Design a protein around this nucleic acid. Structure first.
Length: 77
RNA sequence: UCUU
C-alpha cells in the first residue's frame, strides 16, 4: 500500500532526513523519505501504522502545540 | 498543517 506523512512548521530550526527518521522508522512496511529544508515529508507503506505512529509520537499533553504530524493516506504513487 |  501507499501513504504520505506531513510535518508541521516545528522543525524550522534546521532539519535533516534523520529528524524524520527519529520520528517515524520502526513502523509499517516503509518506502522512502522526502526531507525538505523548511519541513519534511515521508512516503511509507501501511497507512494504519503511519496513523498509529502519529498517536505514538505526536502524543499531546495540556501544554499546547508541541508536536504536529499529519497522515495523507493516498494509496497512489 | 499539504512540499526550495
Amino acid at each position: 500500500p501507499k501513504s504520505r506523512l506531513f510535518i508541521g512548521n516545528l522543525p524550522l530550526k534546521n532539519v535533516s532526513k534523520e529528524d524524520l527518521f527519529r520520528i517515524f522508522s520502526p513502523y509499517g512496511h516503509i518506502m522512502q523519505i522526502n526531507i525538505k529544508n523548511a519541513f519534511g515529508f515521508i512516503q511509507f507503506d501501511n497507512p494504519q501504522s503511519v496513523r498509529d505512529a502519529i498517536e505514538c509520537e505526536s502524543q499531546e499533553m495540556n501544554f499546547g502545540k508541541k508536536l504536529i504530524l499529519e497522515v495523507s493516506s493516498s494509496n497512489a504513487r
